[PDB]
Design a binder for this molecule. Sequence first.
Ligand SMILES: NC1CCCCCC1
Ligand SMILES: [Ca+2]
Length: 223
Amino acid sequence: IVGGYTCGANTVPYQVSLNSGYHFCGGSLINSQWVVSAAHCYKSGIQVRLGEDNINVVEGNEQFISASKSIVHPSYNSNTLNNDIMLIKLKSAASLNSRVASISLPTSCASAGTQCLISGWGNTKSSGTSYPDVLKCLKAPILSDSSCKSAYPGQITSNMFCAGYLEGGKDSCQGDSGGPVVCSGKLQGIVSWGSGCAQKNKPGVYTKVCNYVSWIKQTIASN
Ligand SMILES: NC1CCCCCC1
Ligand SMILES: [Ca+2]
């Protein structure tokens, strides 16, 4: 997260870190045994880490649970990043509490102008590299479809939205991939892609979760 703030320990209780020897992606806990992330975060050997703040120190509220399976969206295209969504099932159910909690799926899509919370352990620099150990947060509005399409001609599908600031300076970045965009207590987006981070007229692009609610529910119900 570039141009954000330190969230505070366990203030984003649905935020997970995906770890394969190291943090490589964010995710969102949607019930006791399932996490939603980006399809471009797919890999084998995933351990889901819940209750994290400092991802380099065991602080006492963590639960470490290996994934039993991952399900990438059937229509995910890794070239265009259309349908950039994946479900991860935990080998055992997480113990839910104030610091480890699921985030509700949307019942309807969020509109341009809606204020959202974006979070993750990604790069905090727009040029060069610095990775924070503690969770970073960014408050950012959803942008209009027209401004999103104007920013990224030929690349924005009906399964994507832009959020952030056309002036730059505030954005998600490398390592935030797969993490949450939460608006009015609902998971509306997944950190997906962008051209660099925090660059003028290149806001972050996010997977439009409301389009996938039926798929998520049905997949969970049979897996
Ligand atoms: N805003 C994006 C975050 C996802 C990873 C690519 C970097 C820029
Ligand atoms: Ca920790």
